[PDB]
Amino acid sequence: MAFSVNYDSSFGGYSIHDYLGQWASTFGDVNHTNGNVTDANSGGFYGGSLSGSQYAISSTANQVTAFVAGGNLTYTLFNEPAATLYGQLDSLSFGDGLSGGDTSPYSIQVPDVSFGGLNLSSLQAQGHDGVVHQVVYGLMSGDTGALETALNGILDDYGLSVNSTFDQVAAATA
Ligand code: HEM
Ligand SMILES: [Zn+2]
Ligand SMILES: [Zn+2]
Ligand SMILES: [Zn+2]
Ligand SMILES: [Zn+2]
Ligand SMILES: [Zn+2]
Ligand SMILES: [Zn+2]
Ligand SMILES: [Zn+2]
């Protein structure tokens, strides 16, 4: 599992960039900035108040659209590097309807699209500009830039990019 995709068949013909743009447009922007944080726009880990096996959040614009990152995600709320998600990211899953996350895993009710085998490490020395911090925080802000750049990294070894279809990426993994 040095990479894999799964997807609702409706997206076979979407480029990765096109699905992510659709996803970001309706997810919106959680607005995780100063003066504006809440219970509502923070997310949560599965397996701890602050560290865990997956981090997940729902859109505060439509209550529904969501993602879940999953690998080995420690955080540092007030710790040495102030407010910076570090660790290990293996998977991103996008879609509608986040449930669970307490004594069960975070699970998406209506999955769209899912990447596994990302192999992306940032250690807590690298702060609020590590890499998993930049991806995840990016996603929390409706900004897929950081995820699309990393994906092109993974995908260009297969002679593809995020501007190729899901069916196409599927073919190149087997
Ligand atoms: C792992 C996912 C998380 C990421 C990537 C993240 C990242 C950030 C970033 C980049 C800021 C910068 C604020 C700014 O400059 O405007 C921030 C603020 C903040 N975050 Fe997080 N955070 C995460 C999880 C959490 C969690 C679980 C909490 C707990 C409720 C939390 C509480 C806060 C607080 C209290 C602030 C500053 C509030 C203020 O000064 O007004 N964060 N976060
Ligand atoms: Zn469908
Ligand atoms: Zn914003
Ligand atoms: Zn959707
Ligand atoms: Zn939808
Ligand atoms: Zn959908
Ligand atoms: Zn950007
Ligand atoms: Zn490469």
Side-chain angles (χ1 to χ4, degrees):
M1 259 348 89
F3 191 66
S4 56
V5 294
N6 283 107
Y7 51 100
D8 194 275
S9 78
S10 64
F11 306 113
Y14 284 43
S15 70
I16 287 164
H17 149 81
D18 271 329
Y19 172 74
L20 289 172
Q22 208 122 301
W23 174 87
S25 183
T26 76
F27 183 79
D29 186 27
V30 122
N31 190 353
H32 200 101
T33 49
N34 296 340
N36 310 146
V37 181
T38 324
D39 26 43
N41 73 188
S42 121
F45 296 71
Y46 171 53
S49 253
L50 244 49
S51 61
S53 179
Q54 52 175 195
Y55 168 80
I57 180 155
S58 307
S59 143
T60 67
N62 83 1
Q63 269 57 65
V64 162
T65 300
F67 76 92
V68 187
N72 176 53
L73 274 184
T74 327
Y75 186 43
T76 72
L77 167 117
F78 268 37
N79 240 215
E80 269 82 38
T84 109
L85 177 57
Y86 83 96
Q88 218 287 142
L89 178 51
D90 247 335
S91 64
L92 281 325
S93 316
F94 300 85
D96 298 319
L98 192 51
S99 95
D102 221 51
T103 54
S104 39
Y106 284 114
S107 160
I108 297 163
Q109 198 209 200
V110 179
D112 290 342
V113 136
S114 187
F115 305 90
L118 284 244
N119 201 70
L120 303 162
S121 334
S122 44
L123 325 189
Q124 61 198 118
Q126 295 164 223
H128 134 319
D129 40 95
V131 38
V132 325
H133 175 267
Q134 276 184 289
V135 169
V136 170
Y137 186 73
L139 291 173
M140 296 156 43
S141 320
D143 184 318
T144 53
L147 194 240
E148 273 171 291
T149 292
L151 273 167
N152 273 355
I154 301 161
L155 271 167
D156 92 284
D157 295 76
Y158 301 72
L160 295 176
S161 67
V162 299
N163 274 103
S164 340
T165 62
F166 272 100
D167 285 336
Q168 270 185 270
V169 173
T173 57

